[PDB]
């Protein structure tokens, strides 16, 4: 409890095909305000930079979406928003690291200067 992996490691495990957050730990959940049983079935992006459109866009081709844009991005230090709304800038990095037998997309949110 003096680093990050146990301090407040925002770990969101999802599928790479359609996403859908499989489960989340007591750290990541703490970051926003969900949990493996409170955010499951939905998409992490729903609780990041605009829960209306941006979520459905960033979940597509990913990256800038338009290559060289700042409209919808979810794989870099961006400004996210929690269920309660905090619009706090954090670092986001999505990558397929698997977890069982399917390419599992993982996202780790790290508070800036925190």
How many Cα neighbours within 13 Å face the side chain of 12? 34
Catalogue the long-range contacts made by 40-48 (C-beta closer than 8 Å, 24 or more residues apart).
Answer: 43/14, 43/19, 44/12, 44/14, 44/19, 44/107, 45/19, 45/74, 47/80, 47/81, 47/82, 47/83, 48/74, 48/78, 48/80, 48/81, 48/92
CA-CA-CA-CA torsion sign (94, 5, 8, 43):
positive
**Contacts of residue 4, Cβ cutoff 8 Å, sequence gap at least 6:** 110
Method: NMR
Residues belonging to the chain: 114
Map out the domains of the chain as residue ranges: 1-114
The CATH number of the structural domain formed by 1-114 is: 3.30.450.20
How many Cα neighbours within 13 Å face the side chain of 103? 7
């Amino acid at each position: 409890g003096a680093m990050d992996p146990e301090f407040n490691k925002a770990i969101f495990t999802v599928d790479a095909k359609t996403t859908e957050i499989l489960v989340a730990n007591d750290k990541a959940c703490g970051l926003l305000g969900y949990s493996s049983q409170d955010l499951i079935g939905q998409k992490l992006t729903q609780f990041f930079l605009r829960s209306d459109s941006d979520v459905v866009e960033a979940l597509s081709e990913e990256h800038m979406e338009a290559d060289g844009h700042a409209a919808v991005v979810f794989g870099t230090v961006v400004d996210i928003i929690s269920r309660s709304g905090e619009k706090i800038p954090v670092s986001v990095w999505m990558k397929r690291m698997r977890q069982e037998r399917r390419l599992c997309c993982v996202v780790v949110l790290e508070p800036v200067e925190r």
